[PDB]
UniProtKB/Swiss-Prot annotation, chains A, B:
GO BP annotations, alphabetical order: tRNA methylation
Listed name of the protein: tRNA (adenine(37)-N6)-methyltransferase
Summary of subunit composition and partner proteins: Homodimer.
Domain TsaA-like: residue ranges: 6-125
GO MF entries: tRNA (L-threonylcarbamoyladenosine(37)-C2) methyltransferase activity; tRNA binding
Family matches, as CDD domains: UPF0066
Signal peptide residues on this chain, from the entry's feature table: none
Gene3D superfamilies: YaeB-like
Family the entry assigns: Belongs to the tRNA methyltransferase O family.
Pfam families on file: TrmO_C, TrmO_N
Length: 186, 186
C-alpha cells in the first residue's frame, strides 16, 4: 500500500467566496445554491446516467485532535459534504449538477461524486460529549434593488448576516458591509 | 487547482479477507468488528485527543453512471464508511481505534478519520428511484469448537451465510465451505 494521486473531476460554483461567507447552518439559507461543473474527460452523460434518481449527493472535495474535529489542516485535506440534488443538466458537452444549499467556497475542486444513501450514511442518534432581525439602510435598500435584476433574491440571500461595528462579507461579486444594519452593497 | 497526493494515515484490520466476505448488511453481524491502526507519524495521542467523545466515525479509505453508484472503479477510488467507535486505545506508541461492525476488507488503507456528526451527515428521508437458518454438519460443529478458543464467537460470526452447492468464503485465517449447511472449517 503506497500513496495515491487524485485528479479533480469537477469544480464547484458557489455564492460564498471565502470561508467566512459560509453560514454555520447552510440548510437554512435557501439561496446559497451551487452548480457542480464536471471537468474533461469526466463530463460525459454516461458518467451521470441516472444520477437524477437520488435526491442527495456526497461531494469529496479539497480543503482537540485533528481526527476528532472537522478542521482543514489534515494529513489529507479531504472534505465531505452532502448536498441536495436539484437538477442534472446536460448541454453541449457541459454537465452541470445544480445542487441545493451548499457550504463549499466558490471554485473548490471536487474529487468524487457519490449518491447519498440513507441506509449506509444516515445515523441520527450519533452522540458527542440566536435568530437576528435584518435591516437595510436606505442606501442599502437602493443598492440591493439595483442588483435584484441580475441576481434575483439577493435581498433574502442575506439570512447569513441573520447569524464601532462595520464588518465585511463577500457574497458573489459583492462586498456587503454591516439586529444588524447593512450599509453599502458594492 | 492541480492534482493531490495522498498518504495513507492508517490500516484497517477486519475479518473479511476479500470483498465477497462482506455482508450487504454489516450492522447486523455483531462480530464483524475492526481495529484501525494509525501509521507513523500520525499515531500520536495528540492526533486523537477527544476522539472518544463521538460515538461514530467516518473513514475515507482506498477502494448506470459511475457517480450514480458506489462502484470502486472511479477516477478517484475514494470510499467512505461510517463505523461505530468503541474504544480509542493508546499503548507504547501504538494507537488502535477499536471500531464496531465494519464493512472494509482486511488491510485496507485509510486516508482520513473524521467524527460522524449527525447534524451535517444525517439525512434519513434520502430518496431513490430473506433471513436464512444456519446449520453446521457434525464435522463442522467440531472444527468451529476447536477454534472457539482462539477466536471466540466464531460460530455466531456466521450470520454472514445467513444472507451441486459447495460455496466458499474466507473469514479470518479460515475458509468456510457450505437454510444452508456448513461443511468444513479449515
Amino acid at each position: 500500500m503506497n500513496d495515491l494521486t487524485l485528479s479533480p473531476i469537477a469544480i464547484i460554483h458557489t455564492p460564498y467566496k471565502e470561508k467566512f461567507s459560509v453560514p454555520r447552518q447552510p440548510n437554512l439559507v435557501e439561496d446559497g445554491v451551487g452548480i457542480v461543473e464536471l471537468l474533461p474527460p469526466y463530463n460525459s452523460p454516461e458518467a451521470v446516467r441516472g444520477l437524477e434518481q437520488f435526491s442527495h449527493l456526497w461531494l469529496i472535495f479539497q480543503m482537540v485532535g485533528v481526527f476528532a474535529s472537522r478542521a482543514t489542516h489534515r494529513p489529507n485535506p479531504l472534505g465531505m459534504s452532502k448536498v441536495e440534488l436539484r437538477q442534472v443538466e446536460c448541454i453541449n458537452g457541459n454537465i452541470f449538477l445544480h445542487l441545493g444549499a451548499v457550504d463549499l467556497v466558490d471554485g473548490t475542486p471536487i474529487f468524487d461524486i457519490k449518491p447519498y444513501i440513507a441506509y449506509a450514511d444516515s445515523e441520527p442518534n450519533a452522540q458527542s460529549s440566536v435568530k437576528m432581525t435584518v435591516e437595510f439602510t436606505e442606501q442599502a435598500k437602493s443598492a440591493v434593488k439595483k442588483r435584484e435584476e441580475k441576481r434575483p433574491h439577493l435581498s433574502r440571500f442575506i439570512r447569513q448576516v441573520l447569524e464601532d461595528r462595520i464588518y465585511g462579507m463577500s457574497l458573489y461579486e459583492f462586498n456587503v458591509k454591516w439586529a444588524g444594519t447593512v450599509n453599502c452593497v458594492e
